[PDB]
Amino acid sequence: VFNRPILFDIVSRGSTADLDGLLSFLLTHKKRLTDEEFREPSTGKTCLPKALLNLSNGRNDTIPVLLDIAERTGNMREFINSPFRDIYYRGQTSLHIAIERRCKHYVELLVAQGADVHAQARGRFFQPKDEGGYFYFGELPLSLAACTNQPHIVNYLTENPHKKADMRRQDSRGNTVLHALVAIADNTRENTKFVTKMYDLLLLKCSRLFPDSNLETVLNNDGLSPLMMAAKTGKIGVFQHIIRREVTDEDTRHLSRKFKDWAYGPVYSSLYDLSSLDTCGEEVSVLEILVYNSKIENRHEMLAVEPINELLRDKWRKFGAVSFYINVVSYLCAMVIFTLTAYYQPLEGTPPYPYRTTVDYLRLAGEVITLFTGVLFFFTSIKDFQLLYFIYSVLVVVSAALYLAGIEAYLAVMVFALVLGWMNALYFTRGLKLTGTYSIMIQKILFKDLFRFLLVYLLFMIGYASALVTLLNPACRDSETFSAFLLDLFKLTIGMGDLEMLSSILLLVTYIILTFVLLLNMLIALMGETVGQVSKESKHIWKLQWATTILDIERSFPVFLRKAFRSGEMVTVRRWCFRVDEVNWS
Amino acid sequence: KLTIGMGDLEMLSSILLLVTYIILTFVLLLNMLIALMGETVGQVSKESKHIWKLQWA
Amino acid sequence: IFTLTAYYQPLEGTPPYPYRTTVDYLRLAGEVITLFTGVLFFFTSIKDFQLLYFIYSVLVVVSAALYLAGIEAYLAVMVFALVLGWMNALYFTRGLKLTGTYSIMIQKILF
Amino acid sequence: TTILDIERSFPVFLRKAFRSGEMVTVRRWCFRVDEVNWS
């Protein structure tokens, strides 16, 4: 009125007599209901938002009568939609608010009046929880009705006698209702159940409306696809149902992911449809995302879903074992050849081309094999953990270059290459003999032990040294200042004992006692932490390393060569199916 | 053998990658013993109070 | 800085005021920093686990007093201050790198 | 312990405090927390 706040209070309180008098003088002053007077200077909130936020147990049946003011004001189109301007709320519309409050009557009234169901609420508060926002639902009224556990209004909005927001419509993020529904999907039981139920309903409805292309196919700007998005973001709750989706209606057969081909009583040959878990290098697949990504929080249980686990096992038995054994054996033999070439490295130095003997010819063959494997490894690395492999490749290349120069005193790089490669040997052997605790061990204690040791060791060493050189301007030395003899003395103490000093001062013994006890109890704590962490690797870590090895091998050799998983039918049941056999007596 | 069991190792040198070799082998053997202890205690679990019964039978 | 000052502690003993060199000036700056931190720690302790911190502060103060006396054979208190302070170093590092098992270890087996 | 020791260490008259809030009926130095529940 004279000031907006009293109008806002009146609309919040739901008064009508004063309110239709307000309408009266608004008619008198020819002022549009969307004027700056009715919108905040900062937020620009209209009457409708404030009225709906004050929803009193669904008793806002009157404020539509207020909205009836609009056509009298002559500005109806812009009035319904409310394009907010706050960075904290950008684009939020009255329809979003009405649907949010979990009441369908006002949603029906607004949409029937012509509410713009295609609303892109690109507000910071609407962005995912990890992008500074608080709630992401797909930035669409239909996706907002969906994500918020609101079946009836998603049905109605898709079945209203007026403009009905097509499920296909993609927001700015490109998500669509399915992607949004998996975005807020939680791994908890209630969220998982409601999300999966509504997800089924939604996909079935879209299929019935659009048999030409099921909504699963349509991707986002990222391009993941709903299943791959539930995979990349650790959404086991949806994922585990996405894999095993089988429905009833005949018109909805294609939109299933687990057929049942034949049964013989207590044996069921369930035919999973992994039409997107292995693209043969064509596009991204759930296996690549699931295994070659660490942001997942539920990797181990997400590798336990039936088709993925059985498919890893099949790729292992069929081709993984042979290729892995060939690779590891070839690596070991080639590097043993390298090691023997180093052992038989031409004596007397100066190897310009010292090979005039049969054993010399064998040595030259071994060196050629070493260079070939090194250059091939460099090619793989550049085409492609990889850190150490590339270090080995470059070291081999440099050693070969220096050797071909016929210069001396530069075999050191060759020895470095040897030692780095054999250190990679344990990385490769991880997959053999069902091993791999060693890799966990190397990535567990390595840094902590060196950190603490180096620090306290050198530290008490210098503390010792100050007083020692205080005593002597003899025993630890003959002359001059060198902490090196004191370092040697401390090594003698820690590993050897029988320590000698010029003194024959007690704080020195205190230093020794403290460092010794600290290192011993450090080893004890490392043992305890390691045993706690591993817990026999929970029987899962090795499985993840195994999957890593299998997929690495599969990607290694070209896939145009016909090494693929099972195949299947042509139409109505050309889906590259995979089989699984399970017996149940229920 | 002197290095692993005895220490007080001597060389012609008086080259660092040698010390790296020594450190890596020593740490590997120690943590190998640790892992063997852990796996043994996990496996036995006081032989689950059954293995000895099978040997007895 | 304290530890390096001890390592570079003026040779031949008798440090009345032996700083006529650039490296000597750097050593004097390090010793001044040591005394400043020691006296500040004493101020915090008197204003204020605290046991060892106060021991370090008093040891630094006594070492500074003896050094300013220009007398010899009394750097021992300085070395005591150094070792006690670095023992407090683990107490302070408890909060860094999500550590702290070491403090539990020291208060578990020691006695 | 470390956090509170640090906070007490430097003077508090320097304006390093927790969240703030309203004036009356809701001058209580409130603090906020965000939690999502699907019940």
Author numbering:
A (entry chain A): 148 to 531, 549 to 637, 658 to 688, 696 to 764, 774 to 786
B (entry chain B): 675 to 688, 696 to 738
C (entry chain D): 484 to 531, 549 to 611
D (entry chain D): 739 to 764, 774 to 786
According to the publication:
The transient receptor potential vanilloid 4 (TRPV4) channel is a polymodal receptor that is activated by warm temperature, osmolarity changes, and many ligands. Like other members in the TRPV family, TRPV4 is critically involved in a plethora of physiological processes like temperature sensation, osmoregulation, and mechanotransduction.
To find a reference agonist that does not bind to the cytosol-facing cavity formed between S1 to S4, we first tried to determine the structure of mTRPV4 in complex with RN-17477. Furthermore, when we mutated the residues in the S1-S4 pocket, which lead to large changes in GSK101 or Agonist-1 activation, the concentration-response curves of RN-1747 remained unchanged. Therefore, though we have not directly observed where RN-1747 binds to in mTRPV4, we believe that RN-1747 does not bind to the S1-S4 pocket employed by GSK101 or Agonist-1.
